[PDB]
Design a protein around this ligand. Sequence first.
Ligand SMILES: [Ca+2]
Ligand SMILES: [Ca+2]
Ligand SMILES: [Ca+2]
Ligand SMILES: [Ca+2]
Ligand SMILES: [Ca+2]
Ligand SMILES: [Ca+2]
Ligand SMILES: [Ca+2]
Ligand SMILES: [Ca+2]
Ligand SMILES: [Ca+2]
Ligand SMILES: [Ca+2]
Ligand SMILES: [Ca+2]
Ligand SMILES: [Ca+2]
Ligand SMILES: [Ca+2]
Ligand SMILES: [Ca+2]
Ligand SMILES: [Ca+2]
Ligand SMILES: [Ca+2]
Ligand SMILES: [Ca+2]
Ligand SMILES: [Ca+2]
Ligand SMILES: [Ca+2]
Ligand SMILES: [Ca+2]
Ligand SMILES: [Ca+2]
Ligand SMILES: [Ca+2]
Ligand SMILES: [Ca+2]
Ligand SMILES: [Ca+2]
Lengths: 222, 222, 222, 222, 222, 222, 222, 222
Amino acid sequence: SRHVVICGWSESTLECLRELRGSEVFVLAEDENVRKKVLRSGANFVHGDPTRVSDLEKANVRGARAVIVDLESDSETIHCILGIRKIDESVRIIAEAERYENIEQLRMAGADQVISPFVISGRLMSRSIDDGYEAMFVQDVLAEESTRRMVEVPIPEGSKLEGVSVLDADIHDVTGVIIIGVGRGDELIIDPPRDYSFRAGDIILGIGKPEEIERLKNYISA
Amino acid sequence: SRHVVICGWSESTLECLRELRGSEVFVLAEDENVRKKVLRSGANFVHGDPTRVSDLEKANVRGARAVIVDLESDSETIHCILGIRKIDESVRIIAEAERYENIEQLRMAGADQVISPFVISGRLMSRSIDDGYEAMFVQDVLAEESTRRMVEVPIPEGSKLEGVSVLDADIHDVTGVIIIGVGRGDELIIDPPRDYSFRAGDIILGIGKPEEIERLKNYISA
Amino acid sequence: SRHVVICGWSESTLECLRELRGSEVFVLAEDENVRKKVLRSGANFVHGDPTRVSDLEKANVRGARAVIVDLESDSETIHCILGIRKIDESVRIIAEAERYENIEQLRMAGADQVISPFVISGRLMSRSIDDGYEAMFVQDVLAEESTRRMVEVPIPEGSKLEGVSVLDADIHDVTGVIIIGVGRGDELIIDPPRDYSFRAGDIILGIGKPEEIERLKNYISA
Amino acid sequence: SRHVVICGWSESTLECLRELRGSEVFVLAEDENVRKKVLRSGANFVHGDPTRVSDLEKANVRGARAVIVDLESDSETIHCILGIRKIDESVRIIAEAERYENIEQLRMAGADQVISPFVISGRLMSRSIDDGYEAMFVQDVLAEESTRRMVEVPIPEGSKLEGVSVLDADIHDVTGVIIIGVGRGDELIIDPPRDYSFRAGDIILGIGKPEEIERLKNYISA
Amino acid sequence: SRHVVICGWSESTLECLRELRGSEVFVLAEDENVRKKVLRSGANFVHGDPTRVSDLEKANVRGARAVIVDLESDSETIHCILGIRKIDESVRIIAEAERYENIEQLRMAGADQVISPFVISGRLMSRSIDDGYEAMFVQDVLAEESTRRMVEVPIPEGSKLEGVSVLDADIHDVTGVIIIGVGRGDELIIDPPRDYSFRAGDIILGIGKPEEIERLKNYISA
Amino acid sequence: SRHVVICGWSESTLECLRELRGSEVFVLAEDENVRKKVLRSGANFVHGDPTRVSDLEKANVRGARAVIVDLESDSETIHCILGIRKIDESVRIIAEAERYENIEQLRMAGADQVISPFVISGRLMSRSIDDGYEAMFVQDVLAEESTRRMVEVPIPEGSKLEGVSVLDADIHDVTGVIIIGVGRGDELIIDPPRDYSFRAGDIILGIGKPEEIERLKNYISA
Amino acid sequence: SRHVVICGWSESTLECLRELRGSEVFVLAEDENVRKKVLRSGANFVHGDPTRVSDLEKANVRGARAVIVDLESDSETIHCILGIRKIDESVRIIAEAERYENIEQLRMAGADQVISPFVISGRLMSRSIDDGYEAMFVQDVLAEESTRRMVEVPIPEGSKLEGVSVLDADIHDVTGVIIIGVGRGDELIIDPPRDYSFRAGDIILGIGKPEEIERLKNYISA
Amino acid sequence: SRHVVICGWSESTLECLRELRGSEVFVLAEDENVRKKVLRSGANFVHGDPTRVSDLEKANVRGARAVIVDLESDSETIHCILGIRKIDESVRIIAEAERYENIEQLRMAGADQVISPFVISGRLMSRSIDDGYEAMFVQDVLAEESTRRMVEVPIPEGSKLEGVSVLDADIHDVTGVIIIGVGRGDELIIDPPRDYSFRAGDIILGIGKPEEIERLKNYISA
Ligand SMILES: [Ca+2]
Ligand SMILES: [Ca+2]
Ligand SMILES: [Ca+2]
Ligand SMILES: [Ca+2]
Ligand SMILES: [Ca+2]
Ligand SMILES: [Ca+2]
Ligand SMILES: [Ca+2]
Ligand SMILES: [Ca+2]
Ligand SMILES: [Ca+2]
Ligand SMILES: [Ca+2]
Ligand SMILES: [Ca+2]
Ligand SMILES: [Ca+2]
Ligand SMILES: [Ca+2]
Ligand SMILES: [Ca+2]
Ligand SMILES: [Ca+2]
Ligand SMILES: [Ca+2]
Ligand SMILES: [Ca+2]
Ligand SMILES: [Ca+2]
Ligand SMILES: [Ca+2]
Ligand SMILES: [Ca+2]
Ligand SMILES: [Ca+2]
Ligand SMILES: [Ca+2]
Ligand SMILES: [Ca+2]
Ligand SMILES: [Ca+2]
């Protein structure tokens, strides 16, 4: 579709730019001596300050589909989010929290989703004292190299599943995917109860092999 | 049980120290000006250099049960891991990789579990361009406040499931626990196939309400 | 009435504390070395970080009637404004802008009145090239030692002025004050037209002598 | 007309340069990296030290019609004012005070007008607690984008109003402007009383729509 | 007599404070970390800012007999001299010029005596290319340890030299004091001509052994 | 004769370079952005570090007649003096002491004369409390603008003054110069006693008008 | 032969580059400003990070005959050694230890030889208290400007000395060299006893004049 | 015997203090934070500045037998050496050179033994490219734990070796130590020629076993 604008240069944005091959990516950063690694990773470099509205504007924030903000602190991140919300009130902002208490403030400023990596890292380091199966699970299903992949299938308009609960469906019995959550809008319910009635538009979050994913797509078809 | 040594001070170790309330923690760092913020978290502060073997042997690495190594850079992390493996060759080390290239070096140097936060953050950033149900799942299954919890349940000796396949065990309809993986030793098998026969000593990793967790523990009981 | 919280310390907050005698003021700043100059002016001091929410709750933001934010940069000012809007959504915030670009960001963050000193100073510099009567007017009507004072007077309910045009009222001829604007809510009409009709609750903004101010206050009285 | 010299580069001189388009402006500054932003704002950059007398004479202070001094501290401002007064005893100097105590020292050292932004900001922040119509009035009549403008209209020699009182002249109903003050030489009378007899050469400070300003200009003709 | 105030701390004021042992000295400086090195020299330390009139009035400038102003720059020296002349208009000020151009400004601002060390150092450097007898003379006549001393001897009223010319007085053969200058008021006449008639109230500046100084005082005695 | 090399750029070297017009002057300094003022003052600029022997060598230290060392501290000054003494053991080094106690160490390193300006400034500021005739005398006779000049005349080989004491000479009686000292080699005796026998080669240090200087040259001729 | 890679730039690598003239040297360094001094010392500069594996593979570590590692800290040195050992398992690595504790860690990580300059310096400074002939011996036999040189002379296959003891061989009187030690593989025997039987392939470490070195080389021929 | 003063603190002085047990050591450094590591090694601590003469006299330089100087740069090392030469002219100084250029400056300042660690380290790096027997020899003969020790032995007065050639003596054949040099005063002859005749007072520098050292010490005995 459209392009993706990245404000700031970090390691998180480096791995995001690794995963974003094939799409058009702009990078808005202040450092001039990162242009070689930005152009080698496959993204156009736009010199500028991400907190300033003119430099935000030049990097085509208006026509973007998602803006990814990863600056040095949380004050600059909130300033960048408010500048982007001054330019376009409909674009998607994905921000990164450096501290734990600034998550609700980064949501108040206008970020559509706040990804706090040090909270995830601290909880995995706390749960990995006895045996580290949770960290292995997270770092394995997020990688697009394993046999099982976490993908979101949507329930199409006019399917066989409208009104049918998950207890009447038995998707794991007929397909073999593991239905770990069903999302609507911006709300996700992990491990939904048995009388949860399906709708048209609910996004099914599941884990399975791509053969099971294609079988699940063929099962919920129109 | 025994104590837990934390080498270095950052935000990851701060959240790990928050989630370790109720246990004994020794914190080993060069900064003296972190003594209040260590001591307000319920942790015994020990001044020293984590890369030095004398300042390591100060903080009781021999009697510990797990060492968490999160220093300022990755070279310092590998040096401190080598200094730990000089002292006690069988203690559990949980490291943190600040770069993606250094994970095999941190695992060769001796760390039992390497947790790279920037790779997880980049993969959750790149997968949240459309809709962020995966980042919501990851950030909500780990918090120790939500309704559903990810747990590890061990299989005792003499149980009712020795040799029983996962299809005939029928965990999800009977108990209500979503079985996302069965782990053994130092491998984790995510979404195991239907011909997988259990063994006494396996670890079942699941998601469910605590009533379903109690029902699963009473269901696999000897 | 209630108290007033001040975040940060500069010359603007020093002059604001000079103009605020008779009230109770809580200053919140990071430097300990300013406790002597804060406590000399007749105001309490609270050590802390004004961007952090807990240090804001130490300084009693919830029970305050106005919060005045003047920090070292506009990013920290926006971050402190969102930290205040976390605690009490309906408190009054007066912010100070360093640059002209950040005024709409400061209003989007939640500030109820953004006062930019450098913009006023630049527009008084570039207007005093020929003859400086504008700068003299601005700097003479604001001081509370002159003979002519800019005074906000409300129109009480049940007054004789409700539904009266400003030509039919002839305020300057009977009372002697100069009606330079009529405001209601967050809008202000400078030099209002002759067909404008007064209503109850509107604020009359005028310049005049104190005796003329008293005569006007007794003229709108029922 | 002739050129304008600006000593130092900050925010106040930046907005002053924004309003001063069309004339010739020489910006004298110590930093060399401000050259691009000075030339982009529309002024000729002259590298030098504003405290030195030779670097002042390089920037053509002798022929200018006004010199605007805004340096880093207040001692540097007094030093630059003393240097300009050593060069030229007739030029108009506009200074910016950092503290309230140095206004009399800057006026004794030779500044034709001292503008104190922090005193104005502190008084507006202290008068904006209840409701901020004063800050709205100041920042709306100084901005040259609103409908009303604060204009200085000089009384010419041979006008119709030589020797009439302001009670008998009755400017506001016949022209539509608001007479907030009158000026003579270096003095200003805000809200002049009704027995004030007009003279020739007096400057009328007023607020009004430009149609009312042109009606007042045609009213005071010869 | 009374005390001596020293504003600012550097090496010049350090040697001046060494040569003022036996007297009372107030030292006024911004640095708190100079309290030991001030107090070990026998001087009462006063914290404050020398450019501020309140911190000047702290250090007893009104009751002093001489104020020595050696601050970090020359603009600060002129500002502090103006602040001193605000308080006591007749106290003696000894300044120090860090640049050659600022001597007339430091004398216009109010300093009774301006002592520029870099000009003296440059003139003693350039005159010591061949042989340094002039620099040796200057650096050896000032030290209070050598055999010959430069002294000021006043002429009392009723002396033996009223109206007596310097040729008929014959000071060098009778007493042994080298008469390099006769001073009066605020002028010094170096090598006065033979027709110079003395007056009661003149100051004779001479070089000689202290026995010759006693012989000169007993020779000009009334 | 030959050239003069100046190591380092300060105010003392600036006034020394002002007094050294007509001679060939090299300047060895580290800062590149002083080349404009060095080339405007009339001296060739040699970029380099004065402590390094290769950069010392390039600036033609070998063929010089005097090297003037004025660096930022006394350690760098001693390092420069030892480098120059490694290159040429016969050249003249004129150094400047920044602290008082390093005078004997700057003489131990190999400087031919050490000019300590802050000691002279402190002693003049200490002697200028009562009346400042000493500072006026020093700063007037060092200036080549007054009527009296401090010049050194040498006694030629074969003069009329060999063996004649100063008591038999009466140079001030026959000429009118003030003989304030007689130097030989590197020793100066200020105010010499009456039986001091003159030699051939003794350097007479005197103060007088240039007519008296020419008369003194004609009196001590061969 | 083949090239030599130097990781990092300091004083030790500078003197090593001074002795290594004639070969091809690739200097890998983080700083870009060291490019001119590297190219003036006679080596090809390769900009990069010596800890990264890709920036190591850019500098042709695979084909080199020795890699010299000297970085800022000891952890960075262990990291670069681990990276080179990940690239190549046969190349010769020479490291420099900063502390005495890390010699065994650098040898375990894969360094073929660890040189500790501070341990040698401390032992020479402690053995130079009485008289410093040890430091003179070391710094004279390592300098390639003296008369004697420390040479390694290998024993060839088929030589006359296969199977003779060093008592019967009697090298010193017949050749003139001093046999301080013999080496085999990775071991060295200093002052070998008289029953030590020579073999083929052994390296003889000796000191002597080059005439004696050539006499020893002709002595050990086939 | 007497005590030893150490100026500065680094790894070289740490190893020198490790090699100096049995003696009394006074460490003089600026940092207070090194008092714990100084007092742990069995040495007294003196806070002060090693370049200042009074802080040197606090640490008893006059009664010392050797002073070891190792400061942060060569300028401060030269300044400290000249400060020591002020106090006691005949004390022994061991200095440490940072660069190769400053060795002759350090010897001209007064140091009796200049030990450059980086030059020795660079010449051992550039000689271990092929096979590192030189670095092994240098780092094995210096440690006081091996079996072969480099030991200075004097020739006592009245010995049997006075006037004896080194061929006629045959020291290696009877005693078993390797005579690698003969030194007298501040000169050393490495690999002395066969015609060299011994004299009383000369120092024999040799490598051997401790029993062979005792046999040599009893062989020169009268
Ligand atoms: Ca980041
Ligand atoms: Ca676990
Ligand atoms: Ca499956
Ligand atoms: Ca970390
Ligand atoms: Ca998604
Ligand atoms: Ca469930
Ligand atoms: Ca501000
Ligand atoms: Ca105007
Ligand atoms: Ca009125
Ligand atoms: Ca300003
Ligand atoms: Ca108000
Ligand atoms: Ca109107
Ligand atoms: Ca000074
Ligand atoms: Ca001279
Ligand atoms: Ca005399
Ligand atoms: Ca200087
Ligand atoms: Ca005096
Ligand atoms: Ca005369
Ligand atoms: Ca090194
Ligand atoms: Ca020795
Ligand atoms: Ca030989
Ligand atoms: Ca060193
Ligand atoms: Ca070799
Ligand atoms: Ca032996």
